[PDB]
Amino acid sequence: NLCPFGEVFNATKFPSVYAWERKKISNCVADYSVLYNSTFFSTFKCYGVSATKLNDLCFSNVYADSFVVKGDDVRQIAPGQTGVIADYNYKLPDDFMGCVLAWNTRNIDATSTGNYNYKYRLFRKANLKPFERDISTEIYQAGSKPCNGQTGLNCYYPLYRYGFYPTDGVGYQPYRVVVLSFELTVCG
Amino acid sequence: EENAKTFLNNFNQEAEDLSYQSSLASWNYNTNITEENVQNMNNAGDKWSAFLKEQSKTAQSFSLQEIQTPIIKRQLQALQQNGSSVLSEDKSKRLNTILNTMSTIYSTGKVCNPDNPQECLLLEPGLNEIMANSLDYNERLWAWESWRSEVGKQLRPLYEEYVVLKNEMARANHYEDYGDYWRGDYEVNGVDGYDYSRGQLIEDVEHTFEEIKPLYEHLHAYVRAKLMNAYPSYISPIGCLPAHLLGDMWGRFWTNLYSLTVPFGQKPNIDVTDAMVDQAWDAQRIFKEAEKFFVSVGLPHMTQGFWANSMLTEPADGRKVVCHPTAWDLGHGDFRIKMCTKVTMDDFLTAHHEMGHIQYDMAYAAQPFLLRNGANEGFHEAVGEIMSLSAATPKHLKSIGLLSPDFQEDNETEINFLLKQALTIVGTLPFTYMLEKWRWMVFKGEIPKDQWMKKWWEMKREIVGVVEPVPHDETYCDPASLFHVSNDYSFIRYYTRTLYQFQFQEALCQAAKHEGPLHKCDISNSTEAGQKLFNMLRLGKSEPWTLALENVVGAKNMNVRPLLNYFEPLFTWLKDQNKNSFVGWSTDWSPYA
Ligand SMILES: *[C@@H]1O[C@H](CO)[C@@H](O[C@@H]2O[C@H](CO)[C@@H](O)[C@H](O)[C@H]2NC(C)=O)[C@H](O)[C@H]1NC(C)=O
Ligand SMILES: *[C@@H]1O[C@H](CO)[C@@H](O)[C@H](O)[C@H]1NC(C)=O
Ligand SMILES: [Cl-]
Ligand SMILES: [Zn+2]
C-alpha cells in the first residue's frame, strides 16, 4: 500500500509551531508525484537531497512535521536560522536531509475577528536543540528571583498568540508548513 | 542587561496587535463615517492608549544608562517618555474636551453672507473657493474676516485654556513649556558629533532663514507689483500685502496667485488636467501609473492588499468619507491610501506624494515597532515631495504620454514653472517660521494673553510682509484660524521638510547623473539612485535624524544651498524685474490707517 501523505497535508486541523506534531512513515511506497506535479505549494524548499532523486530512492523512515507560522517566519524553517521560531519553537539540524513545503492558508486560518488559536514560544532560556519540542507554559523568569507561578514585572508568559487577520499583509498571513525529514522501507 | 531585552520583545509583539486594532478601526471610520464606528475607532484606540502608558511607566523603571547595544538604547527612549497622562484626572478630560471642541468648530464653522443670509458656507469648499478664485477685494475681505470673527473668536477662550493646560503637561515632563515639548523631536542625546539640542532648533531655523530673505524679498516685490494690477489703489508699492489677497484663507500658499503673477501667460499652460480626461483615465490609471514610477527605480510594487483595501475614489453609492488624502500604515504589512482622487494633474501629483509615504513605510517595516517611524517629523513629508518634484517635470509628463511630444521647453516656460513652484515652496517659508515662532513665544510666555493679537500682526508685517486688512483686538484668534494650530499640530515640520526635500533632490540627481538644472531632473529609470534612497528609508527611527540625513546628503544638519540652486534661474530673473520696483516692505502701512 501507499503512504498516507493526505493525513498530514490535507489535514483539517494544524497545530501551533511550538507544539508541532510528528508522524512516522513506515513500510509503504511514497508518492512524490502529487507533490511535484502541483503548484499548490508556495515554497517547496529542499535540503540535503534534490527534488528529483528521491523518486527512485529508499529511506529507513520518513517523518512529517506540520505546524503554522506567519509569512515572514517561513524563511526560519531552514538549517542555520536564528529567528524566534528557529531558536525557541522549531530548529532544524545543520545536517538536515529533506524538503520543507509551505502554502498560504489565509482563507482557512484567518477569520474576520482574528484567529488566535495558533501560538508560538517567545521567551525561553537558551535555544532549542535540533528537532526538540517544548510545550511548557512555565512562567518565564527574566532577571532576578522567580515568579511563584505568577506573571508580572520581569515575569512574562512564554507563549504568545499569532492572531491572523484577512487584511494582513502577505508576510503576516498564516502558512501551513510541512517538514519532510529523511532518515537513513520507504521507496518510490 | 538581558532583562530589558525580553521586555521589548514582549512589547513589540503585544503592541503590534493593539496598534492594529486601533489602526484598522481608524480606517473603518475615515472610510465609513458612522456613530457606531466612532466608538470602535475610539475604544480600540483607548485600549491601545492604556497599553502604551502601562509600558511607558514599566520601561521607565529600567535604568536608561545601563544599556550597551545601540538598538536597545534608542528603543527604550521611545518608551521612556512620560506622555500626557502626567496631568490630573479632571484636567486631562477638560483638556481633551477643548481639543475636540476646537477641532469641531473648525470644521462645523459656518459663516453666512450679510447680502444673502440663506447662503451659509463652510471652510471647505465654501470659504476656500472664495479665497482661491475671487478677485473682489470686498468679497475676499468678507470671507477672510468672517472666518476669523465668527469661528475664530470662538477658538479664543478655548485656546487660552488650551495653552495653560498643555503647558502643565510639558512642565511636568521635564520641559520648559509646550513649545519645548515639540522641539524635542529633533533632539539627539547619543553618538559623538551627532547630538542636537532642543534650543539648537531655534538657532538653526533662524540662521538658515537669513539666506532665504534675499530670494523671498524679491518674490514679494514681484508679486506685489502684479497684485497692484489686479487690486488697484488697494496696495501700496512700499507697504505689505493684504492678508486676504494671498491666494487662500491664511496666506500660507501663494499658489492661486499664479493666475495673477504669471511671468509669460501667453505660452501654453503646463496643467495637463485636460489631457487626462480625454484619455479616459480613472483613479486606477493614476495609481497604477504611479506604481510604475517606483518600480522603475527598483522599489517594490504596491502589494495586492493595497489595491484591494485602499480607497482610491470617492466611495459614493451610500457612504461618507473624509476626503483628505492620507497615507496609512496600519501594520501587519497592511498599506492603504485614503484619497478621493479626481482626474486632475493636482491629484496625479498627490498620488506620488502619498505613495511616497507608503514606500517609506514599506522600507522601515523590518525595524522594531518602537523604531518604525520617520527620522524626524519632517522626513516623511520631504520623501513625498521629492517624488512629486520628478513627476512634475515636462520630461516625465511627455515620457508618460500626457504632454505633447513637440512641447517647446523655452527659457520662458522654465521661468513660469519656477515662479509657480516659488509661489508654493518658497512662499510658505516665512509664514511657517512666523507662525511657529509666535506659538513658541506664546508657550514660552513672552507674549501675554492680553496682547496675543498685537504681537501676532506685528510679526506678520515684519517676518512675512503681510498686513491685516482690518484691525483686530484681543477677542480674535487668528493663529488658531489655521488647522494645525486649532487641532494641536506642530508646524515647524513644514519648514524643515522643505529644506530636506531639496537636499534629497540634489543628492539623488547627482547619483542619477543628472546634467541640466535641478528643476529639470527626473529620477526615473535610476535604479542606482533608487538604492541610495533605499539606504536611508530602511533606517526608520533607529539612527538619529542627523545620521539618517548624512547617509544620503552627507551632512549632519539642514542646508539652504540646495533650495537656492533650485530657484537660482528665477532668483536672477526676479532681481532683474525688481530693478525699478521697491524690494522690501514697510511695517507701518495698513489698508485703513
Ligand atoms: C524608463 O522610464 C521611462 C519613462 O519615464 C520609460 O520610457 C517609456 O517606455 C515605454 C516602454 O518601453 C515606451 O513605449 C515609451 O515610449 C517610453 N517613453 C519615453 C522614452 O519617453 C522607459 O521604458 C524606462 N526604461 C528605460 C530602460 O528607459
Ligand atoms: C458602515 O458601518 C456600519 C456600522 O458602523 C455598518 O452597519 C455598515 O454596513 C457600514 N457600511 C459600509 C458600506 O461598510
Ligand atoms: Cl493669518
Ligand atoms: Zn504627506
Coordinates of N, CA, C and O in Angstrom, one line a residue, chain A residues 70 116 120 122-123 140 142-143 153-154 156 160 163 165 167-169 172, chain B residues 3 6-7 9-10 13 16-17 20-21 24 58 62 309 332-334 336:
Chain A
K70 N 3.7 32.6 10.6 CA 3.4 33.7 9.7 C 4.2 33.6 8.4 O 5.0 32.7 8.2
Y116 N -6.8 33.5 16.8 CA -5.7 33.5 17.8 C -5.5 32.1 18.3 O -4.9 31.9 19.4
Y120 N 2.9 30.6 19.5 CA 4.4 30.4 19.3 C 5.1 30.8 20.6 O 4.6 31.6 21.4
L122 N 7.9 32.6 22.7 CA 8.6 33.9 22.6 C 9.8 34.0 23.5 O 10.8 34.6 23.2
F123 N 9.7 33.4 24.7 CA 10.7 33.5 25.8 C 11.1 32.1 26.2 O 10.2 31.3 26.6
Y140 N 8.0 32.5 32.6 CA 9.4 32.9 32.2 C 9.9 33.9 33.2 O 9.5 35.1 33.2
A142 N 12.7 36.5 34.0 CA 13.6 37.2 33.1 C 14.9 37.5 33.8 O 16.0 37.0 33.4
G143 N 14.9 38.3 34.9 CA 16.0 38.8 35.6 C 16.3 38.1 36.9 O 16.9 37.0 36.9
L153 N 5.9 41.9 36.7 CA 7.1 42.7 36.3 C 8.3 41.8 36.2 O 8.6 41.1 37.2
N154 N 8.9 41.8 35.1 CA 10.1 40.9 34.8 C 9.7 39.4 34.9 O 10.5 38.5 35.1
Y156 N 7.2 37.0 32.5 CA 6.4 37.0 31.3 C 6.0 35.6 31.0 O 6.7 34.6 31.3
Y160 N 2.9 33.1 23.2 CA 2.0 34.2 22.7 C 1.3 33.8 21.4 O 1.8 33.0 20.7
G163 N -2.8 35.3 15.9 CA -3.9 36.2 15.5 C -3.9 36.7 14.1 O -3.6 37.8 13.8
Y165 N -5.3 37.9 10.6 CA -6.5 38.6 10.0 C -6.5 38.5 8.5 O -5.4 38.2 7.9
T167 N -7.0 40.9 6.4 CA -6.4 42.1 5.8 C -4.9 42.1 6.1 O -4.2 43.1 5.8
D168 N -4.3 41.1 6.7 CA -2.9 41.1 7.0 C -2.1 41.0 5.7 O -2.6 40.4 4.7
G169 N -0.9 41.6 5.7 CA 0.0 41.6 4.5 C 0.4 40.1 4.3 O 0.3 39.2 5.1
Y172 N 2.3 38.6 6.9 CA 1.7 38.4 8.2 C 0.5 37.4 8.1 O -0.3 37.3 9.0
Chain B
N3 N 17.4 41.6 30.9 CA 16.1 41.8 31.4 C 15.3 42.8 30.6 O 14.1 42.7 30.4
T6 N 14.1 41.2 26.9 CA 12.9 40.4 26.8 C 11.7 41.4 27.0 O 10.6 41.1 26.4
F7 N 11.8 42.4 27.7 CA 10.7 43.4 27.9 C 10.3 44.0 26.6 O 9.1 44.1 26.3
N9 N 10.8 42.6 23.6 CA 10.2 41.5 22.8 C 8.7 41.2 23.2 O 8.0 40.7 22.4
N10 N 8.4 41.6 24.5 CA 7.0 41.4 24.9 C 6.1 42.6 24.4 O 5.0 42.4 24.1
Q13 N 5.5 42.5 20.4 CA 4.6 41.5 19.9 C 3.1 41.8 20.4 O 2.2 41.5 19.7
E16 N 2.0 45.6 18.5 CA 1.6 45.4 17.1 C 0.2 44.9 17.0 O -0.5 45.3 16.1
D17 N -0.2 44.0 17.9 CA -1.6 43.5 17.9 C -2.6 44.7 18.3 O -3.6 44.9 17.6
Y20 N -2.8 47.4 15.7 CA -3.6 47.0 14.5 C -5.0 47.1 14.8 O -5.9 47.2 13.9
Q21 N -5.4 46.8 16.1 CA -6.8 47.0 16.4 C -7.3 48.4 16.3 O -8.4 48.7 15.8
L24 N -6.9 49.5 12.3 CA -8.0 49.0 11.4 C -9.3 49.7 11.8 O -10.1 49.9 10.9
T58 N 6.5 51.1 32.8 CA 7.3 50.0 33.1 C 8.7 50.1 32.5 O 9.7 49.7 33.1
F62 N 13.5 50.9 34.1 CA 14.8 50.4 33.6 C 15.8 51.6 33.6 O 15.4 52.7 33.0
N309 N -7.6 47.0 -0.7 CA -8.2 47.5 0.6 C -8.0 49.1 0.6 O -8.4 49.7 1.6
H332 N 1.1 45.1 10.2 CA 0.8 43.7 9.7 C 1.0 43.7 8.2 O 0.3 42.9 7.5
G333 N 1.9 44.5 7.6 CA 2.0 44.6 6.2 C 0.9 45.3 5.5 O 0.8 45.2 4.2
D334 N -0.1 45.9 6.2 CA -1.2 46.5 5.6 C -0.9 47.9 5.2 O -0.6 48.7 6.1
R336 N -2.4 51.2 2.9 CA -3.5 51.7 2.2 C -3.4 53.2 2.0 O -2.6 53.8 2.7

